[PDB]
Design a protein around this motif. Structure first.
Motif, PDB file in Angstrom:
ATOM      1  N   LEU A 178       0.821  -1.210   0.000  1.00  0.00           N
ATOM      2  CA  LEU A 178       0.000   0.000   0.000  1.00  0.00           C
ATOM      3  C   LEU A 178       0.857   1.263   0.000  1.00  0.00           C
ATOM      4  CD1 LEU A 178      -2.618  -1.210   2.617  1.00  0.00           C
ATOM      5  CD2 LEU A 178      -3.115  -0.811   0.202  1.00  0.00           C
ATOM      6  N   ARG A 179       2.045   1.213   0.607  1.00  0.00           N
ATOM      7  CA  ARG A 179       2.940   2.361   0.532  1.00  0.00           C
ATOM      8  C   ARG A 179       3.421   2.572  -0.895  1.00  0.00           C
ATOM      9  NH1 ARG A 179       6.480   1.324   6.035  1.00  0.00           N
ATOM     10  NH2 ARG A 179       4.963   2.232   7.499  1.00  0.00           N
ATOM     11  N   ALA A 180       3.822   1.490  -1.567  1.00  0.00           N
ATOM     12  CA  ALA A 180       4.294   1.586  -2.941  1.00  0.00           C
ATOM     13  C   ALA A 180       3.192   2.055  -3.882  1.00  0.00           C
ATOM     14  CB  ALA A 180       4.845   0.238  -3.394  1.00  0.00           C
ATOM     15  N   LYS A 181       1.945   1.637  -3.633  1.00  0.00           N
ATOM     16  CA  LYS A 181       0.824   2.141  -4.422  1.00  0.00           C
ATOM     17  C   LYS A 181       0.686   3.644  -4.242  1.00  0.00           C
ATOM     18  CE  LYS A 181      -4.145   1.811  -5.147  1.00  0.00           C
ATOM     19  NZ  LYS A 181      -5.399   1.049  -4.990  1.00  0.00           N
ATOM     20  N   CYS A 182       0.795   4.110  -2.995  1.00  0.00           N
ATOM     21  CA  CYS A 182       0.675   5.531  -2.700  1.00  0.00           C
ATOM     22  C   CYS A 182       1.755   6.332  -3.411  1.00  0.00           C
ATOM     23  CB  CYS A 182       0.744   5.739  -1.191  1.00  0.00           C
ATOM     24  SG  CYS A 182      -0.908   5.594  -0.428  1.00  0.00           S
ATOM     25  N   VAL A 183       2.994   5.840  -3.375  1.00  0.00           N
ATOM     26  CA  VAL A 183       4.086   6.557  -4.019  1.00  0.00           C
ATOM     27  C   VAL A 183       3.868   6.614  -5.527  1.00  0.00           C
ATOM     28  CG1 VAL A 183       6.583   6.663  -4.259  1.00  0.00           C
ATOM     29  CG2 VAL A 183       5.597   5.873  -2.125  1.00  0.00           C
TER      30      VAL A 183
END
Ligand code: FAD
Ligand code: 2EH
Length: 392
Positions: free
Chosen positions: A116-121
């Motif tokens: 989910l962090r990588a999606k946000c970035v």
């Protein structure tokens, strides 16, 4: 300038998300999808690599359930979730096997959060790690809205005093272990011994790992002398208590995460000024009902929907408070009813397994069903099939 923004819906919005966990990440990404021209960024107090706990259980095979955070990933299978259809309640060393309610989806917390962090970035949301959030007055002067999604870490933040939490500490002590034993059914294991009452909550979440949460009552915690015991000595003792289930498998805890009383964090309002709370930061509930991440997702979606409307931030935050607080307090009540049952199961050991299963199954009986409220909230958050958006 600590006042909530007013007047009209804002095409120019500067929003900080405090906390890069499930609530903050679902919010930030779903908000940026709804308002691609808003300036949304996340700060995370810990290192990127720090993620607590082991596995979590989530509702359903993704993407059936909109409350399952894996449903928001393009390749959830990459995290090797485990799908459990059976529940095993162990009482007096006798197993009782039965069907679960929804397919339980066990998955590693770390990989969920990192995906989910990588999606946000990738969507253009910046995340800054090892960032102790600035002071309130700095944030109020730098941001149009502060979304507080920092979990039960209340002392780390200075928020308006209307947002002051009510803290309640559970009577049992618990620790979140991981183990290499594989629990292909969700296990709820009751074991009384000479020191006191111990309960294990166990399920597989990868090819190699299971969660093994252990709680014990205050008598067990004192008699077994778990506070003075080292991390290794305590884990050895508990592994002996649960040797029937663990075999020769060991128990590991996460760095800096030891024995704890569960912190039920409650608020009397979800929002004040530029500050609005979601996830555990808005309401925490004992893990024995398995809804924490589900609530994080649903509250995040609710806030996105209110802020997406063609209204001003103050009316939107008021809308959120009036929809989120009743849901959060119902969640709290269900979690408290469960938590209180586990705090008193020592007074229920003479029962048969069938009868203890029935007591457990009935421990939330008097409350309105939590799923009804969750579904009603998602109905709003996800929108309805209508040519023109209108009020219902
Ligand atoms: C033993 C145990 C077992 C559980 N099992 C399950 C389960 O099976 N299924 C389930 O769905 N839930 C489970 N939960 C609950 C679940 O872990 C939480 O409900 C969920 O992670 C809440 O998500 P969140 O985003 O609100 O908060 P968190 O996941 O706590 O995320 C908060 C984030 O904000 C960061 N942060 C904190 N303070 C600051 C600050 N001042 N500035 C910046 N960043 C900050 C934190 O470091 C963290 O990264 C369990 C909980 C426990 C304790
Ligand atoms: C709905 C299943 C929830 C399982 C959870 C594991 C921590 C509590 O026993």
């Amino acid at each position: 300038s600590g006042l909530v923004p007013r007047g009209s819906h804002m095409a120019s919005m500067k929003i900080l998300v405090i906390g890069a966990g499930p609530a903050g990440l679902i919010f930030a990404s779903q908000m940026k999808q709804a308002q691609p021209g808003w300036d949304i960024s996340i700060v995370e107090k810990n290192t990127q690599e720090e993620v607590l706990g082991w596995g979590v259980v989530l509702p359903g095979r993704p993407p059936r359930h909109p409350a399952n955070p894996l449903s928001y990933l393009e390749q959830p299978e990459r995290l090797n979730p485990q799908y459990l259809e059976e529940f095993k309640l162990v009482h007096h060393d006798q197993p009782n096997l039965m069907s679960t309610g929804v397919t339980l989806c066990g998955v590693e917390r770390r990989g969920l959060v990192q995906a989910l962090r990588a999606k946000c970035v990738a969507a253009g949301i910046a995340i800054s790690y090892e960032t102790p959030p600035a002071s309130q007055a700095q944030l109020e002067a730098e941001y149009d809205l502060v979304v507080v999604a920092n979990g039960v870490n209340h002392k780390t933040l200075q928020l308006p005093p209307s947002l002051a939490p009510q803290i309640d500490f559970g009577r049992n002590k618990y620790i979140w272990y991981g183990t290499t034993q594989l629990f292909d059914q969700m296990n709820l294991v009751f074991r009384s011994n000479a020191q006191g009452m111990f309960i294990g909550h166990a399920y597989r979440y990868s090819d190699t790992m299971s969660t093994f949460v252990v709680e014990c009552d205050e008598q067990a915690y004192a008699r077994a002398e778990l506070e003075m015991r080292s991390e290794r000595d305590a884990a050895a003792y508990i592994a002996k208590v649960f040797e029937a289930e663990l075999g020769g498998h060991a128990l590991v805890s996460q760095p800096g995460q030891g024995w704890r009383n569960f912190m039920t964090l409650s608020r009397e309002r979800a929002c004040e000024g530029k500050f609005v709370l979601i996830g555990d930061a808005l309401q925490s509930g004992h893990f024995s009902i398995g809804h924490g991440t589900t609530m994080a997702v649903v509250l995040a979606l609710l806030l996105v929907k209110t802020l997406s409307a063609d209204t001003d931030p103050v009316a939107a935050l008021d809308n959120f408070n009036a929809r989120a607080l009743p849901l959060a307090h119902l969640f709290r009540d269900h979690a408290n009813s469960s938590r209180l049952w586990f705090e008193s199961v020592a007074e229920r050991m003479e029962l048969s397994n069938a009868d203890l299963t029935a007591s457990f199954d009935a421990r939330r009986k008097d409350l309105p069903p939590l799923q009804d409220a969750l579904m009603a909230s998602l109905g709003y958050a996800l929108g309805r099939l209508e040519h023109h958006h209108h009020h219902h």
